[PDB]
Amino acid sequence: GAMGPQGSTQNALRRTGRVNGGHPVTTQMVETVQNLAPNLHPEQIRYSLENTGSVEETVERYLRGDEFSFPPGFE
């Protein structure tokens, strides 16, 4: 009869240390920080959200007055 055990070695790339260097963000994240941080530019928020990976972290660093740079192509 037919056959087909369909099972490959699911051993992906060796366990990394820290997956960082930009995170996927959405419009909802930008507006959230913006609403909670009206003193900030809406474009800088997107960049900070991608670096930090969360709105909350962006809001926490905002309230402490940390550095907020602009996203690539703005400068």
From Swiss-Prot:
Similarity comment text for this entry: Belongs to the CUE1 family.
Subunit (UniProt): Forms a heterodimer with UBC7. Interacts with SSM4/DOA10 and UBX2/SEL1.
Protein function: Component of the endoplasmic reticulum-associated protein degradation (ERAD) pathway. Recruits the soluble ubiquitin-conjugating enzyme UBC7 to the cytoplasmic face of the endoplasmic reticulum membrane where it functions in degradation of misfolded or regulated proteins localized in the endoplasmic reticulum (ER) lumen or membrane via the ubiquitin-proteasome system.
Cellular compartment(s): Endoplasmic reticulum membrane
Whole sequence portion shown: 45 to 115 of 203
Segments for region (Disordered): 5-21
Protein name in UniProt: Coupling of ubiquitin conjugation to ER degradation protein 1
CUE domain segment(s): 25-67
Top-level taxon of origin: Eukaryota
General remark: Present with 589 molecules/cell in log phase SD medium.
